[PDB]
Write a protein that binds this ligand. Structure first.
Ligand SMILES: CO[C@H]1OC[C@@H](S[C@@H]2OC[C@@H](S[C@@H]3OC[C@@H](S)[C@H](O)[C@H]3O)[C@H](O)[C@H]2O)[C@H](O)[C@H]1O
Length: 191
């Protein structure tokens, strides 16, 4: 089950979302259980992974990953909420670009053996799950990169809410790999 374009659905009990601007080279493959593999290069812009839809406030995610990025890429729990429309990330690892660069810091949270700095950014009239919109992005960036473990979402959501970052009704929630003008490979297994 190799994807040929942006796509969503459920595979082996896991929701999957793959978004690509169609550029560069990329092969996103759905695999057994909560696993997926992706190999990419060139000048593409994409993000995809497996998880759940809808996400929940208290989900405890367990994942493993063989992550090998080259350039701007992220390995992170990724999801959205509506009313308010929010795109969020729990960045476990990343490449050459720290997504919080120049972002407004909103404190930090210690969870699952790691420490994460919290940030908020804004996207103006950009693609979203509701079409072209202007929305906030919430980030939890681990101070030390890792590619596997447990992520207790309640600790991230509550840290954000307490810092004044409101969350809406949950849309999808996945363990994603993302890249922008980067290259590399990754095999991620959720659960
Ligand atoms: C830097 O981030 C880059 O990768 C991630 C995307 S976000 C992307 O936005 C589109 C939605 S799918 C969307 O749903 C609504 C209907 S109306 C529309 O036709 C669909 O395309 C994806 O789930 C989400 O991952 C950034 O845009 C991009 O810059």
């Amino acid at each position: 089950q190799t994807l040929t374009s942006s796509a969503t659905g459920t595979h082996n009990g896991y929701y999957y979302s793959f978004w690509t601007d169609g550029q560069g080279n990329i092969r996103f493959n759905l695999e057994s259980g909560g696993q997926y593999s992706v190999t990419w290069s060139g000048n593409g812009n994409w993000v995809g992974g497996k998880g759940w839809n809808p996400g929940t406030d208290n989900r405890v995610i367990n994942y493993t990953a063989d992550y090998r990025p080259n350039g701007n890429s992220y390995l992170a729990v990724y999801g959205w909420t509506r009313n308010p429309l929010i795109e969020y990330y729990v960045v476990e690892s990343f490449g050459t670009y720290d997504p919080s660069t120049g972002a407004t810091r909103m404190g930090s949270v210690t969870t699952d053996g790691g420490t994460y700095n919290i940030y908020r950014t804004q996207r103006v009239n950009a693609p979203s799950i509701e079409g072209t919109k202007t929305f906030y992005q919430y980030w939890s960036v681990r101070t030390s990169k890792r590619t596997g473990g447990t992520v207790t979402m309640a600790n991230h959501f509550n840290a954000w809410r307490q810092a004044g970052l409101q969350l809406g009704s949950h849309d999808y929630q996945i363990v994603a790999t993302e890249g922008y003008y980067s290259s590399g490979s990754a095999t991620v297994n959720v659960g």
